[PDB]
Write a protein that binds this ligand. Structure first.
Ligand SMILES: O=C(O)[C@@H]1C=CC(=O)N1C[C@@H](O)[C@@H](O)[C@H](O)[C@H](O)CO
Length: 320
């Protein structure tokens, strides 16, 4: 039998399928190493894993607030830049402990069979608008969307008014059917068991490709960066750096954006992409101006406090 030579932790579902097609399988073919994708990535699981000393993840995909909390707790190995060679990825994305490989939007989407006319962020947070709502599982993304739904202009979000954001969620808590992960949200859209959600653009667009009659907008959307990183104690840290080097190249980056509606950080992947793909990405001006970019520094400074309040809030008000 063959034990995985490289275990990569991600978010499952259609996004993990897209990473498998663009990154994992092409790396496995090129290196002759078995690449196995798994789920569960996040600060809590990376922290528990690294501190136990029983590290089974070689590479993680970390969204920027999770990446910040992981760097803060010293849970990651410094990236080997003598191995990771992608000068096409701008300097800001090439950090000490991680390489930003993707830009993704989180958007308001609605079931066209319930809302043929669409829904605005203010309507999502209006109790008079009836529909089964799904929010994200953590406070990240959720709070920014609530504030923009309450009239905070996207450019004015930070520092977040956490008390206000929670009162805004509270207005519609009785119609929220879950605080969920991405794969669970796409499943609810496809089954037609939700009416309005806030989810990654790629998840929404893949649900539509699968036949879900939904639409979405960039109003009140939040953009963020995803990083590749290596947990401290990774059994195959050198293999992990070679995978990261491979994955951040223009061709694998272009393939990812071709399969799912998330953007590359490799500026050279834009040279390889058809111009029409640009209009569905978070950086496209028409899209960017209607929402905001997640402020990783604010989350770095406030995540622990916000997380304790969010966990208390969700434990008290969850009803499904
Ligand atoms: O899996 C996805 O397609 C997207 C794309 C990158 C990413 O971090 N994703 C997950 C987030 O949209 C989101 O589900 C987040 O992990 C949760 O809200 C918990 O913070």
């Amino acid at each position: 039998h063959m034990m995985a030579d490289l275990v990569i932790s991600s978010y499952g579902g259609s996004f993990q399928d897209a990473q498998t097609k663009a990154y994992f399988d092409p790396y496995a073919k090129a290196s002759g190493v078995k690449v196995t994708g798994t789920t569960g990535t996040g600060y809590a699981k990376v922290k528990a894993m690294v501190e136990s000393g029983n590290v089974t993840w070689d590479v993680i995909s970390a969204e920027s607030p999770a990446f910040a909390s992981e760097v803060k707790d010293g849970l990651l190995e410094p990236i080997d830049y003598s191995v990771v060679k992608a000068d096409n990825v701008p300097e800001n994305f090439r950090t000490k402990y991680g390489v930003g490989y993707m830009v993704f939007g989180t958007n308001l989407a609605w079931n066209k069979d319930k809302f043929p006319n669409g829904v605005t962020p203010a309507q999502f947070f209006d109790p008079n608008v009836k529909g089964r709502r799904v929010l994200p599982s953590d406070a990240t993304y959720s709070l920014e969307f609530a504030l923009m739904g309450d009239g905070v202009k996207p450019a004015d979000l930070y520092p977040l008014d956490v008390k206000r954001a929670l009162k805004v969620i509270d207005r519609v808590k009785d119609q929220v059917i879950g605080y969920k992960g991405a794969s669970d949200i796409q499943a609810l859209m496809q089954q037609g068991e939700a009416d309005i959600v806030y989810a990654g653009t790629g998840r929404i667009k893949n649900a539509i490709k699968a036949g879900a009659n939904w639409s979405y907008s960039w109003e009140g959307a939040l953009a963020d960066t995803e990083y590749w990183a290596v947990p401290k104690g990774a059994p195959h840290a050198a293999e992990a750096m070679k995978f990261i080097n491979f994955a951040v190249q223009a061709e694998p980056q272009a393939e990812l954006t071709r399969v799912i509606a998330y953007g590359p950080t490799n500026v050279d992947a834009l040279r390889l992409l058809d111009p029409a793909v640009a209009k569905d990405l978070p950086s496209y001006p028409a899209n960017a101006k209607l929402g905001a970019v997640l402020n990783s520094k604010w989350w770095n400074d406030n995540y622990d406090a916000v997380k304790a309040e969010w966990t208390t809030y969700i434990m008290q008000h969850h009803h499904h």
